[PDB]
Design an enzyme around this catalytic site. Structure first.
Site, short mmCIF file in Angstrom:
data_model
loop_
_atom_site.label_atom_id
_atom_site.label_comp_id
_atom_site.label_asym_id
_atom_site.label_seq_id
_atom_site.Cartn_x
_atom_site.Cartn_y
_atom_site.Cartn_z
N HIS A 153 0.50 -0.97 -0.49
CA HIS A 153 -0.16 -0.28 -0.31
C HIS A 153 0.57 1.09 0.49
CE1 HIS A 153 0.41 -0.63 4.38
NE2 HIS A 153 -0.24 0.78 4.80
N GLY A 155 2.74 6.44 9.95
CA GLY A 155 4.84 6.26 10.03
C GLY A 155 4.80 4.69 9.72
N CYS A 168 4.16 1.71 9.62
CA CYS A 168 3.75 0.98 8.47
C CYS A 168 5.29 -0.34 7.82
CB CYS A 168 2.86 0.53 7.80
SG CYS A 168 1.34 0.36 8.08
#
Ligand SMILES: *[C@](O)(C(=O)NC1CC1)[C@H](C[C@@H]1CCNC1=O)NC(=O)[C@H](CC(C)C)N1C[C@@H](NC(=O)OCc2ccccc2)CC1=O
Ligand SMILES: *[C@](O)(C(=O)NC1CC1)[C@H](C[C@@H]1CCNC1=O)NC(=O)[C@H](CC(C)C)N1C[C@@H](NC(=O)OCc2ccccc2)CC1=O
Lengths: 303, 303
Positions: A41, A143, A145
């Site tokens: 993503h 932030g 991920c």
């Protein structure tokens, strides 16, 4: 003496964390050998995230659209592919700090260390369990991920988790390093709910053994039980059923303490039915299920 | 979202840990530049530890009696001196992995990361507070002496603790890196007792702010209080008195949440008097005092 939630030393993982940016989206990647792993993503715009077609979004992406940054240095992306819910970016430089490592898909009830990262930089390290409902109780902001979970076997890092999302209950969900989610979660901005949060019975037993090893034995009662009798009470309190395999795993702690597993099960049964009467066990007022039998042995034997 | 006890990443400290052996005694040392720091009781025989004269025990010791080992490699000891309760061993090689660092004597109520070590090798990392009674709630076995506590300010390691001893209550005591004990403890095998274990009030307030930030606000009541009124109730429950300096330190969290510190004090007052009614706050059934206001801001802002 004393007993604490303890993470693995993080040094070998710190040297693998990079920043990956695609357009306005900046997240963490894991740099091992000549490959960077990150959540797919990273390629999504804030609108894309509502119902993304990742295959279609990748038609629009080339090697040069991925900025990979290792501290102050830009790595050159020479290849990219999607494996399940992870992107693999081939770079022209093998990470010189690559440890001995493997990718593992961890079982529900097992624990790992999370290195929480922001913009490719380590924030902090803490221990998590993969819960029976395939969620973890972490601490993750925007932030985070691409932050990873791992175990260390002497010199070998076993990477088991990559952070993707937060759920309504303030718990977290992610993938193995092959990009397969733990649980039924999908990488899209739609409401997803965790199922019943069942307690890891074998880990609660392990923590009660840890309490005995550290001289806290107020809760040992005069009863024993059977697997089937205990399990009738387990199911009532949304505890995992105990099996002979679980008894076998608790063997070393039973041997160490001279308390038969089924005697400890009887003590657990009375704590479930009667509560702690405002007493504490290893400085906790509730039954802790995020220590495995191995975590107890490791801590109590100085591995 | 979520809130966890989080250690600093340990990589920069891992590269400083060595083994120090003097006779049959093997403990941990800290290798910075060309000096190894370790507890002075490395020189004690099992009889010496009962009532040691360290000055006299050092007459018997030369440079060559200290074996310092950095993984597989023997370091050459070219000097030794005692500073308070620490030995400083001058070696002929500066540690090439020496980080930017400083030695700090930490205040009661402040937190640090412990890297638990055995035989010069990292076991695990966890967060501790220097309690008002100058003890810490750690996890230390035989072999852990010389393990260090630290904070990281961006790139600079602040070393604040060296592990020496366990106390009756299953809590721990040690020195700063200048060899001065926190508290009234002495490095000898005589019965020593921790004084009253007072609660760090400002840290409990900080953790309640963390709970609000993470959507847990069941315990906010309709009352406010005054410093003097709150403190009458504090002293009853062995809480530290709150001062204007503490209110000022909680300012950023008050501003973030729009809850005046004295309103949060009123909520704390009713939790002290009424208990939690079997409810939980950030997954805990008791009031947590080992998060500083800075720990909360750091975690909630991704530093
Ligand atoms: C990571 O994507 C991330 O860190 N991204 C970097 C670029 C900033 C982010 C981590 C989350 C954010 C806050 N704490 C975390 O752990 N993950 C996401 O934002 C997830 C994105 C999807 C993987 C595409 N994500 C989507 C969001 N889902 C959502 O809002 O569903 C609707 C809903 C309705 C009602 C109630 C609750 C949810 C949750 C999530 O983490
Ligand atoms: C460190 O010395 C250590 O790790 N040594 C390496 C060589 C093996 C050790 C760490 C302790 C041991 C168990 N958990 C720890 O944190 N520290 C000591 O053993 C202390 C030695 C002194 C600094 C010389 N030590 C002494 C002991 N004191 C004691 O027994 O007092 C009498 C007493 C009577 C009744 C009840 C309780 C105590 C405690 C201690 O840590």
């Amino acid at each position: 003496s004393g007993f604490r939630k303890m993470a693995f030393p993080s040094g070998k993982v710190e040297g693998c964390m990079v920043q990956v940016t695609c357009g306005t989206t900046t997240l963490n990647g894991l740099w091992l050998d000549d490959v960077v792993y990150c959540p797919r993503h990273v390629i999504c715009t804030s609108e894309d995230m509502l119902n993304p077609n990742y295959e279609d979004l990748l038609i629009r992406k080339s090697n040069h659209n991925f900025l990979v940054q290792a501290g102050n240095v830009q790595l050159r992306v020479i290849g990219h592919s999607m494996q399940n819910c992870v992107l693999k970016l081939k770079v022209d430089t093998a990470n010189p700090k690559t440890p001995k490592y493997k990718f593992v898909r961890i079982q529900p009830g097992q624990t790992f260390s999370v290195l929480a990262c922001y913009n490719g930089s380590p924030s902090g390290v803490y221990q998590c369990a993969m819960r029976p409902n395939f969620t973890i109780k972490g601490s993750f902001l925007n932030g985070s991920c691409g932050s990873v979970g791992f175990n260390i076997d002497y010199d070998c890092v076993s990477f088991c988790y990559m952070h993707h999302m937060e759920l309504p209950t303030g718990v977290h969900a992610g993938t193995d390093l092959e990009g397969n989610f733990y649980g039924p979660f999908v990488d899209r901005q739609t409401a997803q709910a965790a199922g019943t949060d069942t307690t890891i019975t074998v880990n609660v037993l392990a923590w009660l053994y840890a309490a005995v090893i550290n001289g806290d034995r107020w809760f040992l009662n005069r009863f024993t039980t059977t697997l089937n009798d205990f399990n009738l009470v387990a199911m009532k309190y949304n505890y995992e059923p105990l099996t002979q395999d679980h008894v076998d795993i608790l063997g070393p702690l039973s041997a160490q303490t001279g308390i038969a597993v089924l005697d400890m099960c009887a003590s657990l049964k009375e704590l479930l039915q009667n509560g702690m009467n405002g007493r504490t066990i290893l400085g906790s007022a509730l039954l802790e299920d995020e220590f495995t039998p191995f975590d107890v042995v490791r801590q109590c034997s100085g591995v």
